[PDB]
């Protein structure tokens, strides 16, 4: 036998940071959950008990919160590249350094129709991710997303054409629900190193920003064909605003409403036109996914 | 052996509505999880198989259905007094109905500045609950809620003044992180029956708002002494501004975010006034209750 | 405003205890999850930031650990007991302390058909719990239960003979499928301290014991009627073999697995007595319940 | 804009199956969920809303039923096998499927020492799963896994020698506990096609029984180096008694428990040697994986 790949690090580590403006009295969280998993020269920690390969996992934590306190943790994309670049460049036996990071929404409670400057609400589940590879003379490469972004319309969604056989009962519809949690990820081009990241910093809460908006717009206003037609829409077009980025991937449930035929009970007309009250679908669901690319 | 209590029903039952405005063109979603669990003169379908005294659970979620459809889901202390009313006047043998409504979020959207007539985004877990207790003979008991509005203010909070003996390590701070899981929930006067429900039904979401915002409202200015002290305002302050509530009951984890010492790394200074970055804890929390009523 | 009701303390607090036997080598693992809250004189912490009422909850916290490292952990009855009146007794203006213990399950692996010395499997997520109520000047109250114990049988279950109305589309069943996660609690005769309840100790364990063992057999034996004719048959049996238990309650879901009729696709047959593949419902479910008790 | 990637389908279907032997009366059930995506020349339904290359999803949600009340769902690597051949046989635009199968335990009740002809229990939700990729031209590819196994050892697991730097505060130790929970897949050399499958259908129950023995075996008698060192042992031996398989991949997450230093109360001691109660921690975790081939 031999070791073929191996990876170790500390993983479901919570991060919070407070920036206080002295000036104003302003305060800023942020808060995360960070992974960090290191390649490199340690196969022999496998194979011979050689724990002298191994940068403890506990140190490995160590490292994530001095890291956050000696330098910026937003963007998350800058954030993961320096923690990663820090593991390649200071243990020279270590050759890769992945770096996902799970961004958690604090945003500044409105109070009497004014910004509170040290209250905060988690409005909602949806989270921003990145998940950062830093690999040693290959540079930094950075998949980005948004996930957990749920959301429904009630009309102007459709679903008819597809293929009938001796499988198939679904029914064809003009008018449906379409309900989904939206993952969406935008892969980077290839960053040479830090300073290239650092580069571009402001494009990376620009795009998040990009990727959000054209996904709550396209959803809402795309009379769809299907979950597929709607999600190749989406990312064509945040591949047409954000040149930097090589791919987009979308992976969406279709969180299915079934109607709820009540005509056994005194002719209640609650289908079709009449379909007012609705069953939700806890399961199954159907997984529709796509990446796109540049031509 | 005998049957000293007994209830029986369907629990978990997800139900949509929509309203399509026929002018307009605007939609509007509702979504719930109902159970409803019913008492009477049922105990011999447990001592002796007597089935024919049991509305089958099956039938009851027939029921949350076809009630949904004739009637409004809104507000939900409405909705669940009508569900609950309809189960003990049907069945001679019912006594009680208590009916328990979880309502979802699901948010009008807005796209380039103006609300969608038909798209919808969860926007936060919050939930806005009711727990109706429809009793034959004794009106309707209702308990209104919200839980899972998730908060943190990042300064503003103290703790000072506690008990010290020999069990005691916490050390006295005047700045630490205050966050919580908000439940809250206000009682109700008993109500007569459905005609004082409906009577008063504009309530229902004015005392909603009024309980969210007091919680938002103090929690963000608040200096705080103690959850305790805090969620003590709150509760005050609610019953001041209806009187047909006759309890306010809060029940607020304290979700810890502790200081990181650095300083055995490099002299790094992080806590006290100098500290920017803490951990989240998962676990223990503190937990915070009371019930307040008038003098 | 007044205080109504108040309690406070620490949650979700994980324990484990390990015990090593010197001469032998064996050790064994205990692992739980506590919660206490207490009451008392200490409603102007509420009303007044007082404070001095206040045993932090972090103390609440040192003082689990401090009598799980000074006292048996086992059986839970016992530890709820001795950490509920440690508190009444050591703080005068304390009353009442409410435990909740929730016990996880580390069953000693056998290899090559040995118990092995200290190896342990996670074998299910069913708990053991106690919930001890320690009340200065009325005794100490506990509820012993077991939870999360999941089960099916896949025939000798019925349900026939139901109300049938305007309502109802159930057909009637003398074979289908029964699963339920089970939730069975008996309810101790009061004890007047540490003392009375040090004196029943073996009668934990061995009515733990046996309203497993009626649970499953009645369960697996009974060609259950309902769900409420079979779990009265488990309440019944269990009082009838422990006579310091004043009540059994049962909380069971009937988590439906519905058939799937398949004639549409080639004619295939796959109901009633031809019945093979089923649709497990995740939601909704039944939800039945029952506290019997002495005649 | 073009489509790079795509795969569609269902996710989460539950399906249960029993077998009922005439001759013994005794019934056996199998519980699963399923996923099942397509891939194939299907991109115009995301381009062109083209959906005639679309096989609904809720007709690959009839297919399941339809296959697994004709097949055997035992072993699921044989289940996987089949439906992903069918997908790509019947379909001809249709040229790879991806079965994913978790299968949940019912494990038979033995009540007063016989087993029981139509009851089960959950005991543990560990699972066993397989990821079949059948892929048109280039046959079956299976990864086997349990996953879900969660055990712990209280002494007889050591972490000492490791890179220590101005990062690192862990204390080296030669007694600590451990606690994971086991992933583990194996990976099956290609099969041609369903011909090859059937031919190693005794393998697929023989090597999942291996792997978990050796699992549970390696992990209670191993004196740990670390978990790298245990885990590859397990992998090597797995390896060696199964010659189809080509790789074996543990991920392991360190499920840390601390101790709780109490001399700060009365002197008590409960470090080191005394160590007998401990705080185990929700998060963070170290997370240690290795994949393992053939020199
Ligand atoms: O790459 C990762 N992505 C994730 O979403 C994640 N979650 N935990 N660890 C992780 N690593
Ligand atoms: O948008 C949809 N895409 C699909 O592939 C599908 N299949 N069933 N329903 C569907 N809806
Ligand atoms: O839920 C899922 N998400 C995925 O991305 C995926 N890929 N394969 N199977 C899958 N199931
Ligand atoms: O009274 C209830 N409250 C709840 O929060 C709940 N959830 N399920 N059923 C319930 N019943
Ligand atoms: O607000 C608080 N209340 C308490 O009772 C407490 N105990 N420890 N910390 C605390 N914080
Ligand atoms: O988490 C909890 N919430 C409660 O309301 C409660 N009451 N007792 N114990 C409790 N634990
Ligand atoms: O009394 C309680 N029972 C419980 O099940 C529980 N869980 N957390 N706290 C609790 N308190
Ligand atoms: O055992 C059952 N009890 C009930 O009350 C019921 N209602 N529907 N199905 C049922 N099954
Ligand atoms: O799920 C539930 N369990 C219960 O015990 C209960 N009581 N009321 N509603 C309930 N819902
Ligand atoms: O390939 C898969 N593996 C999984 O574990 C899974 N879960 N859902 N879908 C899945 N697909
Ligand atoms: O077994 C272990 N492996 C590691 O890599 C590690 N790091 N800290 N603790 C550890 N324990
Ligand atoms: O929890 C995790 N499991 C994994 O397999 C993994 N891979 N990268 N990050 C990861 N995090
Ligand atoms: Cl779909
Ligand atoms: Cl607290
Ligand atoms: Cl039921
Ligand atoms: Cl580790
Ligand atoms: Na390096
Ligand atoms: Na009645
Ligand atoms: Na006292
Ligand atoms: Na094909
Ligand atoms: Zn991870
Ligand atoms: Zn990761
Ligand atoms: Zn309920
Ligand atoms: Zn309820
Ligand atoms: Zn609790
Ligand atoms: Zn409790
Ligand atoms: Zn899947
Ligand atoms: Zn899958």
């Known amino acids: 036998s031999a070791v073929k790949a191996a990876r170790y690090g500390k993983d479901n580590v919570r991060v919070y940071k407070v920036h206080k403006d002295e000036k104003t009295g302003v305060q800023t969280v942020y808060e995360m959950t960070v992974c960090v998993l290191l390649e490199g020269e340690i196969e022999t920690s496998y194979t011979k008990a050689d724990n002298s390969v191994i940068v403890a996992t506990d140190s490995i934590k160590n490292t994530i919160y001095i890291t956050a306190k000696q330098n910026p943790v937003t963007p998350p994309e800058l954030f993961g590249s320096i923690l990663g670049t820090h593991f390649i460049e200071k243990y020279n036996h270590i050759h890769a350094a992945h770096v996902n990071i799970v961004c958690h929404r604090w945003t500044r409670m409105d109070i009497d129709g004014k910004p509170h400057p040290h209250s905060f609400i988690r409005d909602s589940?949806?989270?921003?991710?990145?998940?950062?590879?830093?690999?040693?003379?290959?540079?930094?490469?950075?998949?980005?997303?948004?996930?957990?972004?749920?959301?429904?319309?009630?009309?102007?969604?459709?679903?008819?054409?597809?293929?009938?056989?001796?499988?198939?009962?679904?029914?064809?519809?003009?008018?449906?629900?379409?309900?989904?949690?939206?993952?969406?990820?935008?892969?980077?081009?290839?960053?040479?190193?830090?300073?290239?990241?650092?580069?571009?910093?402001?494009?990376?809460?620009?795009?998040?920003?990009?990727?959000?908006?054209?996904?709550l717009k396209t959803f809402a206003e795309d009379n769809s064909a299907s979950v597929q037609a709607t999600m190749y829409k989406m990312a064509e077009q945040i591949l047409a605003r954000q040149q930097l980025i090589e791919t987009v991937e979308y992976s969406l449930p279709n969180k299915h409403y079934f109607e709820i035929d009540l005509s056994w009970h005194k002719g209640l007309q609650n289908t079709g036109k009449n379909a007012e009250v609705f069953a939700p679908q806890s399961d199954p669901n159907g997984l529709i996914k796509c990446t796109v690319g540049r031509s």
């Open 125 to 215: 589940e949806e989270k921003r991710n990145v998940q950062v590879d830093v690999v040693e003379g290959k540079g930094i490469d950075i998949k980005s997303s948004l996930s957990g972004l749920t959301v429904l319309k009630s009309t102007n969604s459709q679903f008819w054409g597809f293929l009938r056989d001796e499988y198939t009962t679904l029914k064809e519809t003009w008018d449906r629900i379409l309900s989904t949690d939206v993952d969406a990820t935008w892969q980077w081009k290839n960053f040479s190193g830090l300073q290239e990241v650092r580069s571009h910093v402001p494009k990376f809460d620009a795009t998040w920003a990009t990727a959000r908006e054209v996904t």
